[PDB]
Design a protein around this ligand. Sequence first.
Ligand SMILES: O=C1C(O)=CC(=O)c2c(O)cc(O)cc21
Length: 398
Amino acid sequence: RWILGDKFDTVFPHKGSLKVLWESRWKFACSKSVYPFHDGSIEDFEPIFNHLISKNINDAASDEYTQAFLPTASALEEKAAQALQAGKHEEASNLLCRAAVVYRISRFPYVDITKPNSIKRVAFERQKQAYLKATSLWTQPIREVTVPHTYRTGNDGAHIPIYIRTPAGADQSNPVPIVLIMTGLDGYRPDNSQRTHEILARGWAAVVAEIPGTADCPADPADPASPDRLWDSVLSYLDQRPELNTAKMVVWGLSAGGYYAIRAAHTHRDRLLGAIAHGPGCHYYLDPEWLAKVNDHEYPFEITAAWATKHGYKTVEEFVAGAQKKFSLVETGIVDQPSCRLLLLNGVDDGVVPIEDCLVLFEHGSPKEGRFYKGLPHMGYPNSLPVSYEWLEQVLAS
Ligand SMILES: O=C1C(O)=CC(=O)c2c(O)cc(O)cc21
């Protein structure tokens, strides 16, 4: 039925086993300091995962999992304080970024927007504080701006916290192009250090905003219209920033962010030069058949509970029954209008969202651009990263 093929029916060996996850995948990912351990260090995680495996802790959503990381995070914060006192700004920055990753992994896979007393919310708050302290020491610092949500309606919150980083010499005389990153289910505004490095390196500004139903996004998750209002507020603020050129602006949707990159490519086409949708869902990811086996694939932990909450549902049952007709960009007709240039990047063997959710967009509206990696799972890393920057360079060219 699915392009994923036989692999669709495979129960992946890490399912309900943190031991297998660490020993097969995450240990190596952590060593290489690649996603989701980017900015991180194996020195910090080896003892934590040894602990979790020794206690047979497998459920990431449990407090037993989360609170096993916080003592390490504390030790790194004190080491950073000791580094700062001695005027070692580089080491302090590194140690605080390392602390941020310990917090990050601790609140995987999802910070529950509806539970503000949750230990995963606490960890996320500590992460943001540690990250902003770390990036404050950078030559080009990451700055937080609380953008007033002027376009808010109904159940929308008042404040849009975004991260902004501008390249050396960004001036109103010659305002710089903008890459607006839309983050995902387990990646929020502090989880994009290397992306901001690569954007500034090519002389562009990096802007990072969370998506509806995650982190500190004020958009009503249960209202499919809410992201349209969110970007109206975000883009209005960037219009007003003298050193940022909204005439040369691309959006970069990361995993769950991909949906909102595709949506914005249509809704805000006359305000964007381009959009990248990186491992996106838009339709078939909400098919009950697909949702029946999504928890059995490459995502480190159970995803269906987090997805239900992110889509503004009170139960997984209601989410499965309703989500597709309500949120599908195909079903709702968002795809049946022109779009700005839209690059679609994924692994063909994505078991989190189907490759069909890229291929479907070629049957609607404007021509779409795509590169799909045969054999690779969700996101198609690391192959899909170089081509992203090549495409940005072409779209934002002089
Ligand atoms: O694969 C994911 C993923 O599964 C969830 C994400 O949110 C994410 C992200 O924010 C950035 C990434 O580079 C990758 C991911």
